[PDB]
Amino acid sequence: MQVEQRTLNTAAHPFQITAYWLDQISDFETAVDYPIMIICPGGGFTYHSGREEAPIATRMMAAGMHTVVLNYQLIVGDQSVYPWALQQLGATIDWITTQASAHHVDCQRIILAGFSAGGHVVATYNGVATQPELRTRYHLDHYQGQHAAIILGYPVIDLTAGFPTTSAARNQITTDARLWAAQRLVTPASKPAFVWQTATDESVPPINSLKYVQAMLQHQVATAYHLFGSGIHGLALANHVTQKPGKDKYLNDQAAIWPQLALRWLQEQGLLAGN
Amino acid sequence: MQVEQRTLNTAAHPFQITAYWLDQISDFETAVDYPIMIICPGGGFTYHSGREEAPIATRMMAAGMHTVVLNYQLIVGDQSVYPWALQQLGATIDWITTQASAHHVDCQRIILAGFSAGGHVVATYNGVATQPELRTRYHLDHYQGQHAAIILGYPVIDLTAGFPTTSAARNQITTDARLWAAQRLVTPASKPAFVWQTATDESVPPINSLKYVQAMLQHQVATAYHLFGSGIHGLALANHVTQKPGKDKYLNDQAAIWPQLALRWLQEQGLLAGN
Amino acid sequence: MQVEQRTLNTAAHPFQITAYWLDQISDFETAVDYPIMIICPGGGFTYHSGREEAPIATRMMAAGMHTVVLNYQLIVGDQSVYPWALQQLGATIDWITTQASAHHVDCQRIILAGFSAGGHVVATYNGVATQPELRTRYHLDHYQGQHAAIILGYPVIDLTAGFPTTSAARNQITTDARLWAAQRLVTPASKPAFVWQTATDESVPPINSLKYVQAMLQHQVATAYHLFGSGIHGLALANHVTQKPGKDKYLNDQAAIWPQLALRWLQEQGLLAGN
Amino acid sequence: MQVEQRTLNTAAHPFQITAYWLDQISDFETAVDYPIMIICPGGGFTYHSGREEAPIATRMMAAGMHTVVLNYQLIVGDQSVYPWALQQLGATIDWITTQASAHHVDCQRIILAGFSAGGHVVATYNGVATQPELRTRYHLDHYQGQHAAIILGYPVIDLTAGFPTTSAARNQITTDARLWAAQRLVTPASKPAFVWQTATDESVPPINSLKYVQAMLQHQVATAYHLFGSGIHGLALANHVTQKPGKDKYLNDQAAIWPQLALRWLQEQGLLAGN
Amino acid sequence: MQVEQRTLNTAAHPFQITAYWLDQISDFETAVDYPIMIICPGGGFTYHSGREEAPIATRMMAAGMHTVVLNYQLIVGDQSVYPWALQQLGATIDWITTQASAHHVDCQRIILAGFSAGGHVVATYNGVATQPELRTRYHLDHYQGQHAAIILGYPVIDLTAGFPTTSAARNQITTDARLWAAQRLVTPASKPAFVWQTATDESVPPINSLKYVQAMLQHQVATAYHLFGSGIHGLALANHVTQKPGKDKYLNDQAAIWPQLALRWLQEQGLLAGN
Amino acid sequence: MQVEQRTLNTAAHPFQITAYWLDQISDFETAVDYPIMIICPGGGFTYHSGREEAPIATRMMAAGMHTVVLNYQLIVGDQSVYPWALQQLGATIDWITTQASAHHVDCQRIILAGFSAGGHVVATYNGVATQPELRTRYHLDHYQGQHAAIILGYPVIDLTAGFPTTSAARNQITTDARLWAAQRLVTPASKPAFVWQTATDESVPPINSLKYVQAMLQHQVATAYHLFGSGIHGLALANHVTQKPGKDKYLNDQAAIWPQLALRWLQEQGLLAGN
Ligand SMILES: CC(=O)Oc1ccccc1
Ligand SMILES: CC(=O)Oc1ccccc1
Numbered sequence A, B, C, D, E, F: 001m002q003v004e005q006r007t008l009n010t011a012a013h014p015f016q017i018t019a020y021w022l023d024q025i026s027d028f029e030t031a032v033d034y035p036i037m038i039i040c041p042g043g044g045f046t047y048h049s050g051r052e053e054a055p056i057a058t059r060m061m062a063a064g065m066h067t068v069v070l071n072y073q074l075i076v077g078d079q080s081v082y083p084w085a086l087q088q089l090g091a092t093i094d095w096i097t098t099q100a101s102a103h104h105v106d107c108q109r110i111i112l113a114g115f116s117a118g119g120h121v122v123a124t125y126n127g128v129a130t131q132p133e134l135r136t137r138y139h140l141d142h143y144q145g146q147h148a149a150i151i152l153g154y155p156v157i158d159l160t161a162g163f164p165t166t167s168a169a170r171n172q173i174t175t176d177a178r179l180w181a182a183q184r185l186v187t188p189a190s191k192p193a194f195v196w197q198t199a200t201d202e203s204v205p206p207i208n209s210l211k212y213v214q215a216m217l218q219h220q221v222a223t224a225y226h227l228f229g230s231g232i233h234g235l236a237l238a239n240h241v242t243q244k245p246g247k248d249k250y251l252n253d254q255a256a257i258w259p260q261l262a263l264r265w266l267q268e269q270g271l272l273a274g275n
């Protein structure tokens, strides 16, 4: 295993990635290209949550994929998230295509994963980067490669749907209301989505995931949805690894099955080797 | 996540380790010390099998533990595995104690994992390093730190018990017949052992694991044993990650549950945080 | 000790830092969080002077603090220093807060040090970043963390006060005269300043430092000031370490005591462990 | 030998370089400063061709020079190449001057190599960076150092001269027609050029290189030109190293002597040590 | 291109290597396995000469091969060169086999290159490692992989043949006289040898190379030999790259063609891709 | 500043070093060779004390020298300290000579610093490595380079002189009593020594330094000695940097002047640039 931390400069706003590369198993007689997952964590658009970075990447690497963590555009200075964060995703996928041979990446198996705020970028991107009208508007044109599916964990999907609370916090995120709500952007072009959330999510009401999934079916898009009964927002892995020390509310054994559900779903979709 | 690859020189035969350090999560308020697992892979004493190195490390690391892979003494040159391989383990545990504060290692939770030939070293060590008589005999004296438990996967336990096939290959492994068989070395002071193997193991006969568990019980040491019904030798993870490309015999979905079994077992022993 | 060199992208103009991290002492039974000093060297806004980077960092590291060298915005292309350089400082402090647990940084003990042209950035920042009005104007809002004190060595404080020599050179630094003079930016909210300069400073008139201290006191901010009697501009450490080879005019034994004065002043401020 | 990969932030558009530094020979009793070659590969302004990076840098390194590969501005997002790419070259040369002491670089011996699209940037730069009229217009002022010579392999010199085909592709490269054609930008100020191309270049008509040389003589700049008889576009080293697997058309043994011709030409100019 | 510097511990005397790995070209739609050359420099058995390390490795790398520099056993402390250096060579080849898949090494194309004292190790190894009686005697048994050919530049072949001078120097190198002379070790199992030397070699008489070739033929091993008319010992590349500053005697344009001769010879042996 | 961690294999027992290299100052017109200090920490021959590694290295680095920390042979396995540790010092000095050109090391200014147990190795080495009789006997022959002076801080000088307490502990350190006591090894060939200790040293009675200093004047070798009136063993820097958290007994302001005293002592010896 190798770890690469790096600035990519091929977008208007340069950004940092952290790639975790799988190494070839040395006593294999032949080579294998592995899938790769790009993770956009949460942190409410003002920071990148560590709980949703390495611990999630490591769990997915365990199942045999490369992973990359994208530090997408935050609110800092008077900066807005969009349209920049969308462009950084496109550049990250592009950059991956250039690294394929060196790292044995299966470019037909590029997965994006978003959590909370992170989910908005990915949900939007699955929307935006699947319609050339919105591609051009947002300058995702001229980037190589594309993603095969998305995974969304308790995603922000609609900025008027409870998060963020105050109007003045919507606006920081963006004064472009044409993507306050990722549900309205779904077309039959959108790539297959695995979605999960808790029903008891106070900070990001489940209608977000419902609305995306609802809209995912209404345009015939292969989608799976798990709304677990209990659990607070931001469970991450919902187990001791991502548990804030001494805070039981981060433990939820029912939600903790999601990575297994996710991986099995990726296999079904032909996007991960089956055993 | 950092990757450290390094020679340790505090043994008669210097040796390489590869450490994979967990990084602290930044959204945490307080620091956490994590367990560490040292892995001795298989390879029939002539090599170190990559199938049982990083893939296994990553899976254990996904559960929230540091891991280190130890290139124990092989048959190379007119060299024998023992007693050097034992000293290298002690040196590795020692080295961990000196890295504990920089990496947040919980030294009361140092776990050893052995696979196949690698299991002999760990099994022997579990015996030798808990008996001052054999400690001193084999030069493990003056090393800091101790391991809390072992994990053995399809472990070579007795060199007269099938592997190796010829008498000339077992000699190469060692002239010292006082540890051809680790099942004879087991005494009360030994640390708890989680053991698994398949029953249809041609290469390394199940009597090996049976004999060792027999002796852990006939000696009152907390233990656990899983002998799956089917499967060839060297399953590793028994899934697509460790599957030699196109070889179905490396898939066994029943055996594939062993890491979960092992993690839950560690949690029960209070050697890994629980859920 | 670890050396991290790195681009930070969380500002309008991305920029390089070079971080020098203290490692934990391994025979300490418990962990210690250390203070951190951010250094902005001189170079007359057209370069970053090496004499005021590592040699100064190492002397400060020897007293038990992390250090980071910041390559603030220079005059290059047709770029001005301001307001960008101010933002880069805010982002660096912010970045530090995110690295605190991994490196054991005491974020309550963040010190900024500026030299010559570098002092302007720091002196201005100390004023700007303690006033929401000037904060917001210059886009320092939304960044985490704050500095506890500043250190200024022969600082450029007023752009009309002799440096730079020509009209055409002032302007290249900035077409914003509301920052030509950091002495006018001084208000009571400011963090405490240790200031030193030589009286015979031909290149940057002592009126600069004198004006700043004059305003630190008139606004009741804790300040200490050493105006040494002899010596040219840019003494740095004023000894053989930073002495341009064969040039005695860089040696000044009286000025050479400043790091000691500064460290004791920091201890007095409760911003460094006392011995 | 050392390999440095890194972002430089001293341009409006930050960018990656990959520097390959020569190490001092240890049994030399005195040090030696080595020339350095900056390489801008081709890729038709939409990517950076690996065929024209490392394999070319390694060949030039074998003759005793440092090399740096410059990832100049491409067409990505709605971005055009110019004027940004010209600034990135200036910042790279500038950065080199700042590394000269640590790496023993002879700043009197900075050479630029451009291939295909990369050649346009180098050819244009050679024009722009020698005339302060076009210097100022394109924002190259305040950057230290200067190049002593260029090398152009099958360079794009004129955008209306066959490449790019469509008009829509012209424009993506630039809506500044003023430098669609580096031929008409040559003055006596220009640095000496070694130029080569094949006569049968379908993709980028030979008239391109012909025009630049024609212009290089008509304003009398020391120059040398090799238009080989056979060979497709993008030969690179024109041997097995840069040969696309199983594609004979990338082999051309007459063109393959170009690195020798170039090196001898550099020795002639006093830009490389001689034999 | 990546540079790996590392201790290998798989011999009685552990030892450092410096590997220079070629990176795959990202434009190639398929992958390519490259040959690899192990280089044993000279230094008269008391040091490793830098003139014969990187400079030579870089020239060979430019031709499209991986290279590794082996720091073989010297006369240091009280040690003799043999039989350890032979084991270190075997362990290095072995290590390469384990790196083959991660770096795309063609294990049927492993070439050994020795210079001066380094040449003795290579020449002897070519003999020893091609004879199981002498294989075993010297403990090269149990190591994987083997080399396809050797290259010898002004090699030490016989220790009584003028190098080393005094009796007391030969003995330091080794008291085992059975391989004072690599000519006698030659048998038809020996891999093919490209050999070169100058006839005016005062330091190491030409009869050395003469005798080895003289025996490669009389044992029907494919071999080529170039004895240049002029030139001192230790020409290395015989050009400005390996020339001691201000020392013309290191220049020799006739001998300087040797790397081209060797590469063509390798192509002829099907050991390097042809043009 | 660069940090190099590394195994050296040119001794019977390979060993780790950690080198801290000063970087050249970029705004110097000329280059400068700096002195280098090799540090052997204490730890009572069973471990290397972190209190006496980096913190001391950093403080010496601040004065403008390279530093290297040597992990000399410990009591581990059934291994003794001697004669191995002496060889390791020799190889380290030797290795430095091979790195001089690359790092600008002034090989005429190599200084050894030992603390407590580490002092014994340095003190003995000072004795052994200056007399060819003991040189040959202990196999320091054939290593290049030599040291100019030693620094000893509360050194163990005689193993009967209190430390270690029991006869069982001394013997572990070594059976060879011909260097239980470095005071008896002092002859006038020895390089100059700066020596310090506290009078109240319980664990290692002042007798040791006194006995060494006494013995050092009697062979007319330039020396300096400081015996502070208070303070326990192992003060290191005797300040807050090396203070065990909450343990005042590690603070001693009088002894804390020793680095300054030592540096000024090196200046008069002409082994460090003077200011
Ligand atoms: C225990 C050891 O080999 O020494 C060190 C010291 C600092 C960091 C890593 C290793
Ligand atoms: C820029 C940032 O905060 O991302 C990280 C996170 C952990 C380690 C290094 C960088």
Ligand SMILES: CC(=O)Oc1ccccc1
Pocket (backbone or CB within 6 Å): A098, D018, D048, D053, D071
């Ligand atoms: C054009 C280029 O060099 O792209 C990269 C970037 C990082 C690593 C390898 C290749």
Ligand SMILES: CC(=O)Oc1ccccc1
Pocket (backbone or CB within 6 Å): C018, C048, C071, D098, F026
């Ligand atoms: C010139 C500058 O300050 O950037 C650096 C810093 C350290 C090393 C290399 C480049």
Ligand SMILES: CC(=O)Oc1ccccc1
Pocket (backbone or CB within 6 Å): D026, E016, E071, F095, F098
């Ligand atoms: C002396 C040695 O082990 O080899 C080298 C040489 C140059 C740089 C690094 C290692």
